[PDB]
Structures are given as C-alpha cells and as structure tokens.
Design a protein around this ligand. Structure first.
Ligand code: NA
Length: 250
C-alpha cells in the first residue's frame, strides 16, 4: 500500500487570497519518500486549487450530494466537481455527521453515487466517548463500516480510502495515544478482512484522522496498520510537509 496523506482544510481559510498563498507554500515543499497527497478545500476555493496546485498532488472536495443535479439549493454535486478535473471527495466526516446530522444511509448513498461516477472517496468513521468508555468502540465502528460496504460498487475498492476519527478525543478532555491509532486502524482492517476478504483488506489504505502534528506524525506513521493521515489544522501550516514526509517511517 502507498502511504496516503489528505490535508483537510475544513472551512478554512477565510479568503481565496489566503488559499492562493497556502497553495504557493505547498508548491515549494520538498516531498521525501513515496506518498499520495490529496488536499481538500471549501467548494468556492476548488477552482483555484485545481488551477494552481502542484500536479503531482490531487485536489479533493470536502463533501458531495447524492444526486447529479436538480432541485437541491445549496448543494454541490459530483459532476460539478468532476468538470474541473477533481477526482476526490471526503465523505462522512465527523463534523458533517455530528453537526450537520448526516446519517449512515445518506452517506452510503453518497459513496455509491460518487464511486459509480468515477470519484475516489475518503470515507470517515469513528466512535464517540460513550461507546469508547463502554468498551464498544469496535462494535460501533463495525456498524459504520458495515453500512458502507454494500455501497461500494463491484470493482471500486481501489478507489476507497477509510479514515478513523477518534471523536471520543475531540472536545472531551480525553486524548488519544499512538497505540489507540494503531488499534483502531487494525480493527477496521480486520472488519474488512472478515466481511469482504483479505485481498481488499490488504489494499485499502486506512488513515488516522485524529490530531496529527509534526511532533507525533513519525511515531504514528510507523504503526503497521496506519497507512497515513487525514490531517486537520496542520494542513493549513508549513508543518503539513513534515506529516507528508512521515511516510518514510511507515
Ligand atoms: Na504505517
């Protein structure tokens, strides 16, 4: 598996002029090793990233809707994204599940629609504090992945990346360890192996999507089942390149 680093800008930066400055910084970064890099940005900034970002990396949307077009005011759709040459989207990020109330049925429909229309997806999952403290993390994450699995069209697993988010460690007063990252990425790989087979489990990149910074990326990357990262705030900073370059420890 090729190490994979996605930079999720989330709803940032505030201005397209800042977005262009960030792209200029990224374009001069010296990448070491072997790594697949994707940068996800707000919809309004996708055209300028697609125009200006280094072509050895790829641009990603942060969401898409379930339909090609139509009477869905405010939604952006897969064909719109693709018409710029953009090939990636994030789906099911904890912020969209938990704040914008996207449920698993909605997300499964997005995954199917995106994949059957030639997108690649970064599909996010992860358990909350109650399930973590009950000792039911693997059961919760399995339920999420089991909803995702039937949505993946035949022959499309090459275009699926899964990100694990330790939601239990976001705004809760608890922090995740490196061992927690390894354990939960391994849990996901074992769910894949049991439900769709070892061949698929061995090729799907499973990312850690907790807090990833220059000070912990190397140790996280070295974990055997951690295939990369879905990076939050550090993707807006020069430290993103440290994280990209952590692949050499994997
Ligand atoms: Na690794």
């Amino acid at each position: 598996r090729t190490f994979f680093v996605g930079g999720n800008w989330k709803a940032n930066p505030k201005t397209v002029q800042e977005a262009e400055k960030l792209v200029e910084m990224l374009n001069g970064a010296k990448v070491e090793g072997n790594v697949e890099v994707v940068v996800a940005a707000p919809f309004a900034f996708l055209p300028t990233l697609q125009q200006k970002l280094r072509k050895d990396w790829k641009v990603s949307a942060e969401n898409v809707f379930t339909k090609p077009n139509g009477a869905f005011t405010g939604e952006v759709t897969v064909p719109m994204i693709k018409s710029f040459g953009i090939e990636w989207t994030i789906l099911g990020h904890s912020e969209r599940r938990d704040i914008l109330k996207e449920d698993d049925e909605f997300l499964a429909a997005k995954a199917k629609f995106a994949l059957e229309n030639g997108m690649k997806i970064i599909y996010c999952c992860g358990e909350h504090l109650s399930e973590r403290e009950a000792g039911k993390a693997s059961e919760f994450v399995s339920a999420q992945i089991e909803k995702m699995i039937p949505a993946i069209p035949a022959g499309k697993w090459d275009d699926v990346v899964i990100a694990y988010e330790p939601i239990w460690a976001i705004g809760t007063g608890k922090v995740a360890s490196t061992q927690d990252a390894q354990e939960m990425c391994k849990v996901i790989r074992d769910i894949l192996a049991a439900k769709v087979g070892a061949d698929i489990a061995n090729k799907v990149r499973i990312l850690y999507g907790g807090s990833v910074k220059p000070n912990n990326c190397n140790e996280l990357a070295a974990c055997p089942d951690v295939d990369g990262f879905l990076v939050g705030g550090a993707s807006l900073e020069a430290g993103f390149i440290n994280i990209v370059n952590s692949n050499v420890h994997s």
